[PDB]
Design a protein around this ligand. Structure first.
Ligand SMILES: Cc1cc2nc3c(=O)[nH]c(=O)nc-3n(C[C@H](O)[C@H](O)[C@H](O)COP(=O)(O)O)c2cc1C
Ligand SMILES: O=Cc1ccc(O)cc1
Length: 368
């Protein structure tokens, strides 16, 4: 896999290879303080530092606005302190690491958020449309009871512009200037806040710069947040992730192609370190050639993801369709994935049953 193992210029950095570790929520942080549990999390990331680039798991930018109960945050000094240790360990191995910045939006856990600053103690989204497809996963629920997502409040353009955006900015500054991350990745995918403004199913705003009436206005929040973050920490230290076809939380847009292409053209002027996207849906309902769409509408670094294997990854990079591929499940199960690629070693099979144990089990128990 010569193309997959070839170095790559990304932002102000140079990846040793194009085997990227996708952001992976593992819930290895303290419950209410959302402080990275360094003991386990450090070894986890250090063990995978041979990755061309590691994209750290979705990390909270709004205090207490938790979507996964015990995910990391990057808004407090306590969180910054531990992250720094983790980032330092990755860098000592010669690796690179970006931190994915997230806001759960309507996917926030009610029992935790509502039990709490005009943005505090509230569920926020583009529109008062609750997730209805499924319950809150038991490994994310605040109690043993069957919990369900709530009806969020419609964010005013003012709260968005002056409340939400500044949080992403401080979070990026904290991550890069304090924790020492090489960069950050704006989480504009998988049904969370930004994706909720992005796709039509969850954005029914009648007016404002973030209206759900046009593809351009729906792309505005992703752009504004990304632009503001770029001005604050430099665009060559900023990446963005999207998932135009991911149906999670009932997310759906009728024009995934035009939406994706339009967003590419819109962020093009930002000169981002990269654009990262899921090329499909977890199930075979929503389909489309996202690789093709981004390819013909974006001139920057393209990082694709979803059900890739070394060969397919190597082949698309060879054909110039993508510049790099981020692996999710394979990195969970293979700390030394890169090495296994260099020699075509077989890969450990992942075990979804233990993705969120919060213990060493299914976290640091995968052999090298
Ligand atoms: C346990 C688990 C946690 C994940 N956490 C995140 C996350 O924090 N942010 C994100 O954008 N995607 C997240 N994903 C989605 C993955 O980044 C990836 O896009 C998905 O696993 C499909 O890629 P794969 O086929 O290589 O596994 C997660 C997936 C799994 C299975
Ligand atoms: O499974 C957890 C998860 C968290 C954030 C995502 O974007 C996707 C999945």
């Amino acid at each position: 896999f010569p193309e997959l193992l070839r170095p790559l210029k990304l932002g102000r950095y140079t990846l040793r290879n194009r085997i990227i570790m996708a952001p992976l929520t593992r819930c290895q942080a303290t419950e209410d303080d959302h402080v990275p549990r360094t003991e386990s999390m450090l070894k986890y990331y250090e063990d995978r530092a041979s990755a061309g680039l590691i994209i750290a798991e979705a990390t909270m930018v709004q205090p207490n606005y938790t979507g996964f109960l015990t995910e990391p945050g990057i808004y407090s000094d306590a969180q910054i302190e531990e992250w720094r240790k983790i980032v330092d360990a990755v860098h000592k191995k010669g690796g690179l690491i970006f931190l994915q910045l997230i806001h759960a939006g309507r996917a926030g856990i009610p029992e935790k958020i509502l039990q709490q600053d005009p943005l505090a103690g509230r569920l926020l989204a583009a529109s008062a449309i609750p997730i209805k497809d499924h319950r809150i996963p038991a490994y994310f629920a605040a109690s043993g009871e069957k919990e369900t997502y709530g009806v969020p409040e419609e964010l005013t353009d003012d709260e968005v512009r002056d409340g939400i955006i500044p949080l992403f900015v401080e979070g990026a500054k904290n991550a890069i200037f304090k924790a020492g991350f090489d960069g950050v990745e704006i989480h504009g995918a998988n049904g969370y806040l930004l994706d909720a403004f992005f796709r039509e199913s969850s954005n029914k705003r009648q007016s404002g710069p973030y209206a759900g009436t046009t593809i351009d206005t729906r792309c505005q929040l992703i752009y504004d947040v990304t632009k503001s973050v770029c001005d604050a920490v430099g665009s060559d230290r900023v990446g963005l992730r999207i998932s135009p076809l991911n149906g999670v939380h009932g997310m759906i847009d009728s024009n995934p192609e035009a939406l994706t292409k339009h967003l590419c053209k819109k962020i093009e002027p930002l000169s981002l370190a990269y654009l990262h996207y899921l090329r499909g849906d977890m199930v075979n309902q929503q389909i489309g050639d996202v690789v093709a769409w981004v390819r013909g509408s974006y001139s920057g670094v393209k990082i694709s993801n979803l059900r890739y294997d070394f060969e397919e990854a190597d082949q698309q990079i060879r054909e110039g369709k993508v510049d790099a591929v981020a692996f999710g499940a394979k990195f969970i199960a293979n700390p030394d994935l890169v090495e296994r690629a260099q020699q075509n070693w077989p890969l450990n099979e992942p075990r979804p049953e233990t993705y969120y144990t919060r213990t060493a089990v299914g976290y640091n128990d995968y052999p090298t």
